[PDB]
Symmetry: D2
Subunit: 117 residues, 4 copies
């Protein structure tokens, strides 16, 4: 197969039509018993708005995951205010045998996400 | 009071998209061309009251056409889409249909609202 | 003026083209010093997917707010699985003199939001 | 290797939209009509490799047309949009352009991707 992470993301700046590079992100998984969030990885998006290596196949077990993006810091770095201090996407992985692509389409006053591929 | 309504939002700036030229058409089943029904410009809230009278809202396929690149040019910007058309089926002349359009320079989205 | 709440929402089930009624939601505001979240209101969306009275004008002061929607419970009530256990939208109110409309467009495998009007 | 790519996702079900008929046009500047360039059907990943050769990717206005209602009918469903057209400006024949389309029965979204 491929050595790419089974969970991937892609942040697009839809206001300017370019990848959102330099966005700080963090990945967590919830403890099903305590409901607390365990930090698994942190990163900054690359020039194509992606973050290779978000998680390894070994650690991508079934559970509830959270991706957290520092959206206001991204817009501030471009000199702009924005509506959302950060964006969190919380999602259920029942079958860790699949690939999951979790993109984020961003403007200063809107965002959207989907289970892409 | 029009059964068909719209609402255009500038989601890059978080404001209604005012002063957007729009045109409404119905597909002509004979000629297989688009029959123009109305033209106007969105108001300060990005809406256009009075798009069509209930008496003319027959079942069929309709098209809303929005002059999106002209809008962004009026704000001093370029953009990816010369215009945006939404083609949709009205099968119940007795229901209300709301057709929002969310715009940025490099994306757009639409849905049946309420 | 109007006696409507200055903050409003509208949840649309875009898979079926109808308002998402019966969705449990909760509104919080963050303490700027402790960073903790204070619960301000809870509600269930109505037949039009809205929740009148989310907050009063008196209590809608400047700050960081969070709307939390019980999305998986909504889909489960329709007999469907879905990707997101819940959705949170975190947003900055610097000028509480404005109206803020914070809609949520929902399907089982996608959602989007914007600062509407 | 086509400089123009697409990707159609069924966001209601969280899967690629396979078997969607699409057509690519370029606006004809003389006749002011749409010139058909290519037709095909999305693959199992919702993509269509080979939409246009670089030699034919000249600057201009292009249209991608997707047979959305036929797709939902193939899944046993009705839907609001007979088809979806995305009309976009290519001003740099040397760049790559990716044009995703996100579909549900009652919404759609598009953006310039990467």
């Amino acid at each position: 197969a491929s050595s790419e992470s089974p969970l991937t993301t892609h942040v697009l700046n839809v206001a300017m039509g370019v990848p959102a590079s330099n966005v700080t992100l963090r990945l967590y998984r919830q403890d099903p018993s305590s409901k607390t969030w365990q930090l698994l990885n942190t990163g900054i998006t690359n020039e194509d708005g992606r973050y290779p290596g978000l998680i390894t196949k070994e650690l991508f077990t079934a559970g509830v995951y959270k991706l957290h993006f520092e959206t206001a810091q991204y817009w501030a770095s471009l000199g702009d205010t924005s509506f959302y201090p950060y964006v969190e996407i919380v999602f259920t992985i029942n079958d860790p045998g699949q690939k999951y692509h979790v993109p984020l389409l961003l403007s200063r006053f809107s965002y959207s996400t989907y289970r892409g591929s």
